Design an enzyme around this catalytic site. Structure first.
Site, PDB file in Angstrom:
ATOM      1  N   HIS A   1       1.075  11.522  27.695  1.00  0.00           N
ATOM      2  CA  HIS A   1       0.522  11.051  26.417  1.00  0.00           C
ATOM      3  C   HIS A   1       1.074   9.679  26.062  1.00  0.00           C
ATOM      4  O   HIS A   1       0.415   8.924  25.342  1.00  0.00           O
ATOM      5  CB  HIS A   1       0.770  12.085  25.291  1.00  0.00           C
ATOM      6  CG  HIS A   1       2.199  12.155  24.854  1.00  0.00           C
ATOM      7  ND1 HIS A   1       3.064  13.130  25.307  1.00  0.00           N
ATOM      8  CD2 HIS A   1       2.909  11.386  23.989  1.00  0.00           C
ATOM      9  CE1 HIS A   1       4.256  12.931  24.768  1.00  0.00           C
ATOM     10  NE2 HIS A   1       4.188  11.885  23.961  1.00  0.00           N
TER      11      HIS A   1
ATOM     12  N   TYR B   1       8.232  26.001  18.885  1.00  0.00           N
ATOM     13  CA  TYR B   1       7.716  25.380  20.089  1.00  0.00           C
ATOM     14  C   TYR B   1       7.595  26.391  21.208  1.00  0.00           C
ATOM     15  O   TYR B   1       6.577  26.406  21.905  1.00  0.00           O
ATOM     16  CB  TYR B   1       8.619  24.205  20.463  1.00  0.00           C
ATOM     17  CG  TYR B   1       8.845  23.206  19.329  1.00  0.00           C
ATOM     18  CD1 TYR B   1       7.920  23.053  18.310  1.00  0.00           C
ATOM     19  CD2 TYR B   1      10.020  22.459  19.264  1.00  0.00           C
ATOM     20  CE1 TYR B   1       8.143  22.196  17.271  1.00  0.00           C
ATOM     21  CE2 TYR B   1      10.247  21.590  18.225  1.00  0.00           C
ATOM     22  CZ  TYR B   1       9.295  21.466  17.224  1.00  0.00           C
ATOM     23  OH  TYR B   1       9.479  20.596  16.168  1.00  0.00           O
TER      24      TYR B   1
ATOM     25  N   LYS C   1       0.878  -1.154   0.000  1.00  0.00           N
ATOM     26  CA  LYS C   1       0.000   0.000   0.000  1.00  0.00           C
ATOM     27  C   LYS C   1       0.916   1.203   0.000  1.00  0.00           C
ATOM     28  O   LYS C   1       1.435   1.580   1.041  1.00  0.00           O
ATOM     29  CB  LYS C   1      -0.974   0.046   1.155  1.00  0.00           C
ATOM     30  CG  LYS C   1      -1.798   1.332   1.165  1.00  0.00           C
ATOM     31  CD  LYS C   1      -3.276   1.070   0.871  1.00  0.00           C
ATOM     32  CE  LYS C   1      -4.040   2.397   0.760  1.00  0.00           C
ATOM     33  NZ  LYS C   1      -4.065   2.981  -0.621  1.00  0.00           N
TER      34      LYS C   1
END
Ligand SMILES: [Fe+3]
Ligand SMILES: [Fe+3]
Lengths: 445, 443
Positions: free
Chosen positions: B120, B254, B3
């Protein structure tokens, strides 16, 4: 204060204060939530760009063009008022685009309200009126020299064309001695606007396609010149090369991206979910009037809140009345998309119209495939996509000889099936090859 | 069978079917709706990129690096199983980020639930588990050679860290595999190689690191009896450019002054809506923005869309939050008072973040003021970050290949009252606070 913004295509972009007062409005920030290539992001990871960065790029280039012209040809009488006016127009050309951009004006509103005539451009003028009426930009314009009445006209006419519409001069925002100004932001005659410059560059930067032209070169070697006794944005004869490269670029973007088999299928899919959800989603507008996705374009106060968000609103809904629609989106995620059946073309110069979009599926299902089919498909099981693409290339562009710089030297129809059983796919191909024949369309291959 | 995808950065990324099955799930697709630089987009108009594209790029870079390492060094013994695991680690790396990325776990959760300890990376392990259990991926892993038990352990350790060799996923002789998706030692992992490039490409900054060059002149060498990934001496040049890129991105993007204020503004609107926003979860359990981190069924539906929910909301309970966001549109942002650092002092801790505004408003400016600001008027932004690094890197020489050869805390203060008199009062309060906290004197 001249705010400077760092753009990935144009680098540092200085923005006059009036341009900022406009940008920093709800009406304008709306584009930060409308993907430029729409459904193309589900095929090109790099296509996360939205119409906001585009609108800024177009304002920056439109100004670069007028300012360069006025500096090289003082005779033209290009004023700073004109510069600012052209900048604001190029800054709001796409202010009327809806969720997923073209999907909305080219397939959704046509299948939802086929009697209506909507255009992202009409929407742009309407949102501009809303922006300047809801954020008092009129007095700011006067403060920076612009003449509100006349100039608002000029801007809108730059975005949508002669408003009042072998004769004479049709515009009313500027005189004829400044006709060239009306060819910077949008011009399909020569097919070369500054808008196309930005969208070609940016869609190329993000999609991963190679951009071969250099807008900067044109802007430098551009000059207004007399063509059939009319002031037109002409360019040196040496830029022909660059121009051909630009057309190559345009062609590549259309073949590899804008006309992507899967990207377009995901478009028809999202459109289906929207249609299935149109009787249930509520977009609050003026006075609380509850508009719908399809009707929100009638109250700019709601169209302000109609963005790509709707898609996720659908995906994250709990209302049983939105299950149908929600599952279409769930399909996209899992990658259980509509199945491509075929591709045909109209005959002669015939072009299917938007008002007749809704009818195409039915005609497909009402066909009588010669060989009798096991399974019978119905329209709801059919999707008929009409892909439009907008003549020799450089012949229609104007050029000037450097010694005397003042003078001068379509539809694709694709049918997809919502059912995936090998059976229904074979039946759809039969119904399709028939519809082509009995409507006199090219032979599917 | 494959793919191919087309990325503006890496080019033609080829994706193994197992990866494609992981990607085409609601859990992984949620990353298409979480901006990478979060608040940045409102400062850098081309920073519209989300974590989905980043994830694909880390997946790609991880496979490129392991596959190459093994081709040149068969001795290391790297199987297609290892490559598929490292690839999956790259892809699912960020699965746990929340609305506007680093804002969610670095400020919002810490200000709404000071007691909790959410990262996270933990959430990525949770969402990876949710993904593979909700979309029956375990049999697929088995179909393509993986051992779901061990291999899921390897992937989870590659993301969150250990759980004297501290890993149960893979043995120590394959330790180098744990330095590809995230190396906290030399600060060289493919997550950085991608996010550097992609961020630079959307921000208008230049990236002078040729990740392809590293992957080429990269080998595994021993260091203190620990197999590590080292570079060729001829790559020092490259590595230096990398280390400036990072700094540039940090200094210019940032740590941007306004991007940071805009983020604390977003967090202020979320905090003013948590109690009123419902996120349907497992079993119909309604969750709140700050509690969806506990149930991944709900979390899966927690993206940046929440920003537009509040904005388009009509519920008067949400009006306050709406106004905060309306300011961001109208560009009536919080004002920058000052900055400071906790040098030679204890670093500020998330559990204390909430408490800070009141401290600042409690200060007793030596010279009395005409304006008295309140804790609700201040916003204290603790910016944390993770020497001469080129030395921390390991290096090798071709002749004998086998053998070898910035601040930490930035506290900023913003004020919500934007009149002169108020901003002046704020600078006084802040300076006082810095002093009686033995923090660097505000410039
Ligand atoms: Fe445009
Ligand atoms: Fe990452």
């Amino acid at each position: 204060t001249m705010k400077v913004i760092n753009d990935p295509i144009h680098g540092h972009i200085e923005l006059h204060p009036l341009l900022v007062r406009i940008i920093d409005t709800p009406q304008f920030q709306r584009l930060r939530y409308i993907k430029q290539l729409g459904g193309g992001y589900y095929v090109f990871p790099g296509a996360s760009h939205n119409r906001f960065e585009h609108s800024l790029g177009v304002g920056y280039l439109a100004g670069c063009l007028v300012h360069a012209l006025g500096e090289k040809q003082p005779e033209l009488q290009i004023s700073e008022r004109d510069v600012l006016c052209v900048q604001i127009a190029g800054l709001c050309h796409d202010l009327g685009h809806g969720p997923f951009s073209h999907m909305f004006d080219g397939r959704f509103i046509p299948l939802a309200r086929p009697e209506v005539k909507w255009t992202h451009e009409q929407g742009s003028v309407m949102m501009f009126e809303h922006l300047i009426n809801s954020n008092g930009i009129k007095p700011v314009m006067e403060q920076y020299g612009l003449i509100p009445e006349e100039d608002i006209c000029f801007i809108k006419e730059q975005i949508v064309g002669p408003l009042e519409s072998d004769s004479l001069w049709p515009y009313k925002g500027r005189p004829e001695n400044k006709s060239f100004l009306y060819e910077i932001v949008s011009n399909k005659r020569n097919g070369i606007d500054v808008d196309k410059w930005d969208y070609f560059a940016r869609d190329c930067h993000h999609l991963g396609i190679q951009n071969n032209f250099d807008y900067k070169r044109f802007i430098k070697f551009a000059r207004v010149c007399e063509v059939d006794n009319e002031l037109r944005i002409c360019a040196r004869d040496k830029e022909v090369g660059n121009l051909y490269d630009m057309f190559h670029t345009r062609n590549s973007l259309h073949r590899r991206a804008y006309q992507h088999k899967v990207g377009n299928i995901i478009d028809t899919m999202i459109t289906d979910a929207f249609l299935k959800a149109d009787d249930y989603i509520e977009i609050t507008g003026a006075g609380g009037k509850k508009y719908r996705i399809s009707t929100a374009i009638d109250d700019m106060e709601a169209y302000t809140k109609l963005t790509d968000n709707i898609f996720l609103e659908i995906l994250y809904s709990t209302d049983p009345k939105l299950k149908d629609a929600r599952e279409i989106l769930k399909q996209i995620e899992y990658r259980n998309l509509f199945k491509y059946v075929g591709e045909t073309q109209p005959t002669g110069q015939i072009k299917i119209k938007r008002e007749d979009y809704e009818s195409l599926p039915k005609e497909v299902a009402s066909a009588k495939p010669k060989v009798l089919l096991d399974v019978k498909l119905k329209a709801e099981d059919f999707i008929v996509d009409v892909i439009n693409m907008d003549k020799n290339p450089i012949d229609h562009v104007s050029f000037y000889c450097k010694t005397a710089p003042n003078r001068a030297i379509e539809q694709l129809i694709r049918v997809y099936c919502k059912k995936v059983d090998r059976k229904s796919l074979y039946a759809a191909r039969q119904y399709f090859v028939q519809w082509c024949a009995d409507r006199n369309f090219t032979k599917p291959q």
